[PDB]
Amino acid sequence: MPAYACQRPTPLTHHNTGLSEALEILAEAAGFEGSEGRLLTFCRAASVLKALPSPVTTLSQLQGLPHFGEHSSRVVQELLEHGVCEEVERVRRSERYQTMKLFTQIFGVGVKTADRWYREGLRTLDDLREQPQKLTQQQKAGLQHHQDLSTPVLRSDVDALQQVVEEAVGQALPGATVTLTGGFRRGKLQGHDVDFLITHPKEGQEAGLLPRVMCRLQDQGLILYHQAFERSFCIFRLPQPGSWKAVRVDLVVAPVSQFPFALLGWTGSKLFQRELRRFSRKEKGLWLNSHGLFDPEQKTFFQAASEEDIFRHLGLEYLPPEQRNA
DNA sequence: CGGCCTACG
DNA sequence: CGTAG
DNA sequence: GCCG
Ligand SMILES: [Mn+2]
Ligand SMILES: [Mn+2]
Ligand SMILES: [Mn+2]
Ligand SMILES: [Mn+2]
Ligand SMILES: [Mn+2]
Ligand SMILES: [Mn+2]
Ligand code: NA
């Protein structure tokens, strides 16, 4: 079992859901306590289990696996022997975990903001609404649309959104293209949001494109919330039969020279991409982001035509999007 | 010991 | 700080 | 929490 998540296929459907979900509760809780390091280990351990070919049924089957030490192994052992891990159950039933989960699920609220509100005694979404001067415009919008934003986005919704985004993009710039990214490109059937990557085959034509797209969507009444720029984190008013629902949509523009890097980054998964960037720097001495792959000694950028080109330059076997579900 | 992804809004 | 994957 |  390779140690980096970008070195192994991780399918959407796997065989150790109960174990991985327990480890991911401890990872989320570690984040709520401000330990990115513990979060990362528990996330990595959970991800190792997603890549295994069969169910883990005995603790023996963990020996030698990367990112399993004393703590993650004891969690699995308790689950195998008893069906529950006391530590996991204490976290999941705790007021702190439940409230931090509630608050950080709001668009515009992260751990540091949620932790301050917790320390101030706040506990419910109505507590926040009762104190609106304490909110940014982004948080106001997240709270206003929280019910809709908690409803899974379905493929039906994606296809409708892709059509209205394609229409606005075509109106703003002939020849520009729209590519579905994020979890739906990895094969997920549901999501929290929809992610789109926009480019144009002639380098430089996409300059100024995203404000033009946003103006065109807003004039069609499709935008509930937004705000030169190249990433827009929007809330769309998606028509439904007789009505509408709020949906989170991310729109990203990249020049075509950067498109393989942006496609790779925005397709995820989040852990897959952090692991790939770590691998690139720590194992290959190259710096990776959604704009390019930089050799800091030659001070040159790798010219990629495809995602496959990037994997090859990093010495990695290519994984299609549906195997990046780390 | 000390790192843990690397950007944009 | 928030957002993204 | 795990590991280079
Ligand atoms: Mn026991
Ligand atoms: Mn997404
Ligand atoms: Mn840029
Ligand atoms: Mn230390
Ligand atoms: Mn994400
Ligand atoms: Mn520690
Ligand atoms: Na949030």
Q: Which nucleotides of D are covered by protein (CB under 7 A)?
A: 1-4
Ligand 2 being an ion, which residues bring their Cβ within 5 A of it?
A 182, 193, 195
Method by which the model was determined: X-ray
Residue whose C-alpha is closest to residue A33's, from A86, A75, A91 = A91
Residue whose C-alpha is closest to residue A179's, from A44, A297, A306, A281 = A306
Is the Cβ–Cβ distance between A177 and A252 less than 8 Å?
Answer: no
Strand B proximal to A14 Cβ, under 7 A = no
Residue A126 known to be catalytic: no
Q: For A242 and B6, how far is CA from C1' in angstroms?
A: 43
CB atoms within 10 A of CB A294: 17
Query: Which residue among the candidates A115, A157, A159, A195 is catalytic per the annotation?
Result: A195
Q: Which long-range contacts (CB under 8 A, 24 or more apart) does A79-86 make?
A: A79/A18, A79/A19, A79/A22, A80/A56, A85/A22
Whole-number Å distance between alpha carbons of A45 and A3 = 10
Which amino acid is it at A220?
Answer: Q
Q: For A296 and B9, how far is CA from C1' in angstroms?
A: 27
Q: Is A126 annotated as a binding residue?
A: no
Is the Cβ–Cβ distance between A185 and A267 less than 8 Å?
Answer: yes
Domain locations in chain A as residue ranges? 1-94, 95-151, 152-256, 257-325
